[PDB]
Design a protein around this ligand. Structure first.
Ligand SMILES: COc1ccc(CC[C@H]2OC(=O)[C@@H]3CCCCN3C(=O)[C@@H](C3CCCCC3)NC(=O)C(C)(C)N(C)C(=O)COc3cccc2c3)cc1OC
Length: 128
């Protein structure tokens, strides 16, 4: 499935070049701009442990998820990954634990040492 394909073929979008955040574009977006550090970004998403059968469904699918890019308001992989996305893009991200919740996890949904997988749709972004 998509997690396997991303591990094998996905682009390494990390500074370390550790294949810790891997990306495949699912739907090509608009233009060439990407959000910048500090911009408010607006997304839809689906996330799971990478070996889970189903995406987590514990958030409202209609209401945009909003955060300030690059400010440590979300896991490291999202700050790196959303920064690479064009408006209207849908992307797959496969994420090693050190770019997510690491050895601590976040129990009960996220165990220690968990690899995560997301589908993210970038709806919009705007600067200060
Ligand atoms: C700077 O580092 C952090 C900053 C903030 C947090 C709190 C959790 C944070 O969640 C996330 O960053 C990711 C990506 C954005 C969507 C939510 N995230 C989740 O990990 C998912 C998770 C994915 C794997 C399957 C289980 C669900 N979390 C959620 O979807 C739910 C709804 C379960 N969750 C509690 C929230 O989305 C809570 O709202 C948040 C709002 C901002 C940041 C975080 C969570 C954790 C951090 O590091 C571990």
């Amino acid at each position: 499935g998509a997690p396997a394909t991303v591990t094998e073929q996905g682009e390494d979008i990390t500074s370390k070049k550790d294949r810790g955040v891997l990306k495949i574009v699912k739907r090509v977006g608009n233009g060439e701009e990407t959000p910048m550090i500090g911009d408010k970004v607006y997304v839809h998403y689906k996330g799971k442990l990478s070996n889970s059968k189903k995406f987590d469904s514990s958030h409202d699918r209609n209401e945009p998820f909003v955060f300030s890019l690059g400010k440590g308001q979300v896991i490291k992989a999202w700050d790196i990954g959303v920064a690479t996305m064009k408006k209207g893009e849908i992307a797959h991200l496969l994420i090693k634990p050190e770019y997510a919740y690491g050895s601590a996890g976040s129990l009960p949904k996220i165990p220690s040492n968990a690899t995560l997988f997301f589908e993210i749709e970038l709806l919009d972004f705007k600067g200060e």
